[PDB]
Amino acid sequence: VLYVGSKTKEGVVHGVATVAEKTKEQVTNVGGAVVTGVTAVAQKTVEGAGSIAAATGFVKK
Amino acid sequence: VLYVGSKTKEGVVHGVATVAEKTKEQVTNVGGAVVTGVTAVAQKTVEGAGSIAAATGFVKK
Amino acid sequence: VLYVGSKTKEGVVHGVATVAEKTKEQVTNVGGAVVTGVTAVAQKTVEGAGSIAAATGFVKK
Amino acid sequence: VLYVGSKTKEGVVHGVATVAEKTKEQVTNVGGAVVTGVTAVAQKTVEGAGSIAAATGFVKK
Amino acid sequence: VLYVGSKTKEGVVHGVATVAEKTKEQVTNVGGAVVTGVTAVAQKTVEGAGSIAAATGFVKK
Amino acid sequence: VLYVGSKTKEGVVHGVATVAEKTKEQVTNVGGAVVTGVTAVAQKTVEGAGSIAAATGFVKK
Amino acid sequence: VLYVGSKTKEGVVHGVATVAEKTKEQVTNVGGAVVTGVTAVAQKTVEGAGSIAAATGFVKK
Amino acid sequence: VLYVGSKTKEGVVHGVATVAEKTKEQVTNVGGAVVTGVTAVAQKTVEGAGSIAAATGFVKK
Ligand SMILES: Cc1ccc2c(c1)sc(-c1ccc(N(C)C)cc1)[n+]2C
Ligand SMILES: Cc1ccc2c(c1)sc(-c1ccc(N(C)C)cc1)[n+]2C
Ligand SMILES: Cc1ccc2c(c1)sc(-c1ccc(N(C)C)cc1)[n+]2C
Ligand SMILES: Cc1ccc2c(c1)sc(-c1ccc(N(C)C)cc1)[n+]2C
Ligand SMILES: Cc1ccc2c(c1)sc(-c1ccc(N(C)C)cc1)[n+]2C
Ligand SMILES: Cc1ccc2c(c1)sc(-c1ccc(N(C)C)cc1)[n+]2C
Ligand SMILES: Cc1ccc2c(c1)sc(-c1ccc(N(C)C)cc1)[n+]2C
Ligand SMILES: Cc1ccc2c(c1)sc(-c1ccc(N(C)C)cc1)[n+]2C
């Protein structure tokens, strides 16, 4: 009955340095799912599913 | 009955430096799903599904 | 009845330095799922499934 | 009834330096699931399944 | 007699990302010389002295 | 008599990522010379002295 | 008489990632010379002295 | 008479990752010379003295 939060962190990203030097980056997709290059991502979910970088081929029900 | 939040963080991204030097970046998609290049993203969901970089091939019900 | 959080961390990423030098990066997908290059990702889920870099081939029910 | 958290850490990644020099990186997927290159990832799940880098071939029910 | 320069670089700085988070930065100088915080500086000198971040206490001739 | 330069580099800095998190940075100088924090600096000198981060106490001739 | 330079490098710095987390950084100088924190520095000198991070106490001639 | 340089390197630094976590860094100088923290430095000198991190107490001629 006396919750006291103070300077708390939940789902936090900080202090990120990235260098990426490429000559050729190619993605070829035929009927599927491709996720590429996810950087410095943060989230908080309450009462639900939390997905960040999810690829599902297909759902053929 | 006495929740006291103070300087709390939930789903936070800060301090991000990114350099990307590419000569050729190509994406070719035929009937699928492609997600590429997600940087410095933050969210908070209450009572729901929270997705950031999600690719689903297809839903053929 | 007297929860007192103070400077706590849950699902936190900080202080990350990355260099990536490639000449050719290629992804070829035919009806599947490919996830590539997930860096500096943090999340917190309450009452749900938490996935970061998940690839599912397909769901043929 | 008197939980007192102080400077605690749960699912935390910090102080990570990575260099990756490649001439050719290729992924070829035909109807499966491929996950590649997951770095500096942290999460905390309460009352749910927590997966980071999971690849499932397919679910044919 | 046939100098042919092509895409040459001399005194060049490029691709620099910097983050600096400080709570207190102080400089106290009494009769001296202080240089602080020189970032991403480039020069080319022909037939002369080239100095970038030089501090000389004093010249009492 | 047929100098042919092509894509040459002399005094070059590139691809630099820096993070600096400090609580207190102090410099106290009394009659001297202090140089601090020189990052990503490049120069080319022809027929002269080339100094980057030089501190001389004093010159009492 | 047929110098042919091609993709040559002289005094070059590239691909540098640095993280520095300090609580207290102090410099106290009384009549001397202090150099601190020189990162990712490159130079080329022709027919002269080349110094990068040089500290001289004093020159009392 | 037919010098042919090709993809040569002279005074080159590349691919450097550094993390430094300190609680207290102090320098106290009284009439001397202190050099501290030189990282990822490259130079090329022709017909001259090349010094990188040199500290001289004093020159009392
Ligand atoms: C007094 C009281 C009772 C419940 C209570 C709190 C305080 S604080 C809290 C909470 C719930 C979910 C989450 N996430 C989304 C990670 C974080 C915190 N609850 C559930
Ligand atoms: C007084 C009181 C009681 C409950 C309570 C709060 C305050 S604040 C809170 C909460 C709910 C969901 C989330 N997320 C979306 C992660 C974060 C915090 N609850 C559950
Ligand atoms: C007063 C009180 C009672 C319970 C309580 C809290 C405060 S805070 C908390 C909690 C719940 C889920 C999570 N995650 C999502 C890992 C982290 C913390 N509980 C369960
Ligand atoms: C007084 C009281 C009662 C329960 C209680 C606490 C305090 S704190 C806590 C807790 C639950 C889940 C997690 N994870 C998600 C790792 C971390 C902490 N519980 C369950
Ligand atoms: C045809 C010809 C002859 C000489 C010649 C050139 C072209 S270009 C050049 C030169 C001089 C100084 C410098 N710096 C300031 C480092 C760089 C290059 N020289 C000496
Ligand atoms: C034909 C010919 C003759 C001389 C000659 C060249 C070509 S190119 C060159 C030169 C001089 C100084 C420098 N630096 C400042 C490093 C770089 C290059 N020289 C001196
Ligand atoms: C045709 C010709 C003849 C001489 C010649 C060149 C080309 S290029 C060169 C040279 C001089 C100084 C330096 N530094 C400053 C290290 C690097 C290279 N030389 C001496
Ligand atoms: C044909 C010819 C004659 C001389 C000659 C060259 C080619 S190339 C070269 C040279 C001189 C100094 C340096 N440094 C500064 C390390 C590097 C290279 N020289 C002296």
From Swiss-Prot, chains A, B, C, D, E, F, G, H:
Binding annotation for Cu cation: 14
Region feature (4 X 11 AA tandem repeats of [EGS]-K-T-K-[EQ]-[GQ]-V-X(4)): 1-31
Expression sites by tissue: Highly expressed in presynaptic terminals in the central nervous system. Expressed principally in brain.
Top-level taxon: Eukaryota
Outcome when changing residue 10 to K: In PARK1 and DLB; significant increase in binding to negatively charged phospholipid liposomes; increases oligomerization
Sequence repeats: 6-20, 21-31
Phosphoserine carried by residues: 51
Effect of residue 17 to T: In PARK1; no effect on osmotic stress-induced phosphorylation; increases oligomerization
Protein modification: Phosphorylated, predominantly on serine residues. Phosphorylation by CK1 appears to occur on residues distinct from the residue phosphorylated by other kinases.
Effect the entry attributes to changing residue 14 to Q: In PARK1; no effect on protein structure; no effect on phosphorylation of the protein; no effect on membrane- and lipid-binding; increases oligomerization; increases fibril formation; increases secretion of the protein; impairs copper-binding
Localization: Cytoplasm; Membrane; Nucleus; Synapse
Its biological purpose: Neuronal protein that plays several roles in synaptic activity such as regulation of synaptic vesicle trafficking and subsequent neurotransmitter release. Participates as a monomer in synaptic vesicle exocytosis by enhancing vesicle priming, fusion and dilation of exocytotic fusion pores. Mechanistically, acts by increasing local Ca(2+) release from microdomains which is essential for the enhancement of ATP-induced exocytosis.
Subunit structure: Soluble monomer. Homotetramer. A dynamic intracellular population of tetramers and monomers coexists normally and the tetramer plays an essential role in maintaining homeostasis. Interacts with UCHL1. Interacts with phospholipase D and histones. Interacts (via N-terminus) with synphilin-1/SNCAIP; this interaction promotes formation of SNCA inclusions in the cytoplasm. Interacts with CALM1. Interacts with STXBP1; this interaction controls SNCA self-replicating aggregation. Interacts with SNARE components VAMP2 and SNAP25; these interactions allows SNARE complex assembly and integrity.
Domain topic, free-text comment: The 'non A-beta component of Alzheimer disease amyloid plaque' domain (NAC domain) is involved in fibrils formation. The middle hydrophobic region forms the core of the filaments. The C-terminus may regulate aggregation and determine the diameter of the filaments.
Family note: Belongs to the synuclein family.
Disease cited in the entry: Genetic alterations of SNCA resulting in aberrant polymerization into fibrils, are associated with several neurodegenerative diseases (synucleinopathies). SNCA fibrillar aggregates represent the major non A-beta component of Alzheimer disease amyloid plaque, and a major component of Lewy body inclusions. They are also found within Lewy body (LB)-like intraneuronal inclusions, glial inclusions and axonal spheroids in neurodegeneration with brain iron accumulation type 1.
Name of the molecule in the record: Alpha-synuclein
Organism: Homo sapiens
Portion held of the full protein: 37 to 97 of 140
